[PDB]
Write an enzyme that holds these catalytic residues in place. Structure first.
Site, PDB file in Angstrom:
ATOM      1  N   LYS A 134      50.027  26.694  48.718  1.00 15.59           N
ATOM      2  CA  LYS A 134      48.621  26.404  48.884  1.00 15.59           C
ATOM      3  C   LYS A 134      48.415  24.899  48.986  1.00 15.59           C
ATOM      4  CE  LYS A 134      47.548  30.747  48.308  1.00 15.59           C
ATOM      5  NZ  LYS A 134      48.045  31.343  49.547  1.00 15.59           N
ATOM      6  N   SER A 168      42.901  34.207  51.356  1.00 16.68           N
ATOM      7  CA  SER A 168      43.792  33.425  50.523  1.00 16.68           C
ATOM      8  C   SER A 168      43.573  33.802  49.059  1.00 16.68           C
ATOM      9  CB  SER A 168      43.592  31.935  50.751  1.00 16.68           C
ATOM     10  OG  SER A 168      44.228  31.157  49.741  1.00 16.68           O
ATOM     11  N   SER A 187      52.818  34.940  55.654  1.00 17.06           N
ATOM     12  CA  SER A 187      51.403  35.304  55.607  1.00 17.06           C
ATOM     13  C   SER A 187      50.538  34.265  56.329  1.00 17.06           C
ATOM     14  CB  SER A 187      50.928  35.453  54.176  1.00 17.06           C
ATOM     15  OG  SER A 187      50.308  34.253  53.718  1.00 17.06           O
TER      16      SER A 187
END
Lengths: 226, 6
Positions: free
Chosen positions: A63, A181, A10
């Site tokens: 993240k 996100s 992604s």
């Protein structure tokens, strides 16, 4: 140190990690201490961390750890800037001038590396800037026609919308592609137990779109993450 | 590994 490799499918960590990157992660270690006479691995603020999605622990997420235990985190959805108050004292946070990024998003949505001199139909040029959290600087992307709907945030009991206080032993995670996100803003904190490792390197990169197969190799990306 | 991170 024990190591594990991961694919990046992604765009949530663009421009730092691209779709088609393969990364090496250094697993966090419990210390081995001799009490008669290593150190314990913890995220530092700004670290790229792999962790197990709390709601479905069979999925790995990646993240940036912007919030540490005790941090009061506030996000202004308009300016798209963090404020962080440790041990709640204000963390020095700086932002550079917005400039055009290398990426256009089409809109599901795809991302395309498009040179700054060109344009693309059905697209919006993403903006780029530098965010400095304490002593760590990294890039973020923003979509100029996007803005979070705060009513959709994970809301911490006791707290106004868009402000969180990180519980002990837990972390507040955010992606560098800030409008693309799904991170702690929406699904809350990440417990210590769920951390896997810290991203250390890109060991391979294939040029591809999110669902597509590779168009080429980006060998220029092999090396450190910055 | 070789698995994915979302």
């Amino acid at each position: 140190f024990i190591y594990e490799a991961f694919q990046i499918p992604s765009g949530s960590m663009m421009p730092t990690l691209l779709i088609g990157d393969f990364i090496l992660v250094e697993k966090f270690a419990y210390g081995i201490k001799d009490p008669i006479y290593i150190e314990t691995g913890h995220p530092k603020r700004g670290d790229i961390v792999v962790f197990k999605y709390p709601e479905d622990p069979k999925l790995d997420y990646i993240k940036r750890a912007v919030g540490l235990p005790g941090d009061k985190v506030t996000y202004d959805p308009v300016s798209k800037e963090l404020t962080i108050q440790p041990g709640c004292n204000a963390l020095p946070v700086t932002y550079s001038n917005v400039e055009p990024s290398d990426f256009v998003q089409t809109f599901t949505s795809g991302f395309f590396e498009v040179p700054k001199n060109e344009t693309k139909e059905n697209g919006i040029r993403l903006s780029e800037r530098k965010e400095t959290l304490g002593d760590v600087t990294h890039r973020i992307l923003t979509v100029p026609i996007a803005q979070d709907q705060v009513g959709m945030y994970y809301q911490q009991p006791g707290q106004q919308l868009a402000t969180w206080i990180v519980p002990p032993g837990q972390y507040f995670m955010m992606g560098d592609n800030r409008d693309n996100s799904a991170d702690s803003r929406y699904w809350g904190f990440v417990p210590e137990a769920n951390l896997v490792g810290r991203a250390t390197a890109i060991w391979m990169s294939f040029d591809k779109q999110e669902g597509e197969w590779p168009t080429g190799l980006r060998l220029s990306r092999i090396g450190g993450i910055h | 590994x070789x698995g994915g991170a979302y």
